[PDB]
Structures are given as structure tokens and as C-alpha cells.
Paper text:
YTHDF proteins bind the N6-methyladenosine (m6A)-modified mRNAs, influencing their processing, stability, and translation. YTHDF proteins contain a hydrophobic pocket that accommodates the m6A embedded in the RRACH consensus sequence on mRNAs. The YTH domains of YTHDF1, DF2, and DF3 share a common fold with a central β-sheet surrounded by five α-helices. Three conserved tryptophan residues largely define the hydrophobic pocket involved in m6A binding.
Numbering used by the authors: 363 to 458, 471 to 558
The structure:
Amino acid sequence: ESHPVLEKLKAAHSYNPKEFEWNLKSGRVFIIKSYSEDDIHRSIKYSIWCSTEHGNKRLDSAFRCMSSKGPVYLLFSVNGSGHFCGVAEMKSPVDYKGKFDVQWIFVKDVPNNQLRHIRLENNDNKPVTNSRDTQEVPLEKAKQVLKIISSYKHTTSIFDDFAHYEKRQAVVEVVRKERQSRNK
Ligand SMILES: *Sc1ccccc1C(=O)NCCN1CCOCC1
């Protein structure tokens, strides 16, 4: 049983492409720390993201500075998960509490133990796996991360729980409408 939303997305997008250029000629790369799986699922299916107010202004500034002279890539992980879950390219400036277009490219779980050896000089030389939201990754270390994420032979991804997230969204909307209706 495969869900038609996911079937539609997989046919319209080339997720986890075999020929991905990790040795970037230019670009900027940022960590995104999400609060929940549900937000990741929502972002993949609608091609949008919202950071915090401060996070939005940092990504807005970076995208407009890049002026399409190179990509802005976002490396996604939810707080506490122990893996990265995909990478998207930022595709629009922030629109105002503030959302922007993203294009998901990799959707796959990469355990933190494959990336912990990469450390970020611009964040007290901490592992890239102990970053906060919108932490920027230096270009050479971004190449190392993207090469590992691109080539890692993943065993699972959020897509394996896709129908679960669909039902969760649908139930949440009905619970809210009933609750709003009882307040009137
Ligand atoms: S608005 C959006 C778009 C795509 C995926 C998730 C979301 C979302 O609703 N996020 C809610 C929590 N955010 C945390 C950071 O501050 C903004 C809201």
C-alpha cells in the first residue's frame, strides 16, 4: 500500500539523484533544526519552510546575497533524532510570520555517526551534528557533508512513515475544527 500523495511527489521529483554535484563551485550551506517529523513531512509535500523570526532573517539575507550566483542548501535534522533526514535547496526569499520556497533533493536518513567526524571551525570546532538552527557550514566542510549524504546507502527515510503523517495531519485538522466549533 503506497499513498497517492507520495506517489505523486515521487513521480514529479527526482529524489536522491545519483548524479549530484557535491563538489560545489559556489554556494552556502546551513543546518536546519526542526521541532518535529510533522514539519518535515509538511515541508516535503508543500515545498515550503518557516524558520524562527531570527532564523528567517538569516536565511533571507543569505539567499538574497547569493543572487543566484550559487545555491543555498539546507541540511535537515529534527532535534534529538540522531540522524539527518534530507537536504533541500532554498528557492525564494522569505515572505511575511515568514515562509519561503524550498526544493527537496535528498530524502533519506543519514545517522549522526557518519557525520560526527566533520567539525565546524566557526562554531567552537563542534561536530556538525551538534549544530543549532541556521548554523552555517563552511564550504569545504559542506562538500564533505554533501558527499557523505549523497552517497550514503540509506535503509530508511521519512517516506516509510508517510501514510502515518498524512493521517496525523488529517485527524489534527478535524480535532481543531470541532474544538473551535465548541468555542462558538
Ligand atoms: S509554516 C511551516 C512550513 C513548513 C513546515 C513546517 C511549518 C511550521 O508550521 N512550523 C511551526 C514551527 N515553526 C518553528 C520555528 O518558528 C516557526 C514555526
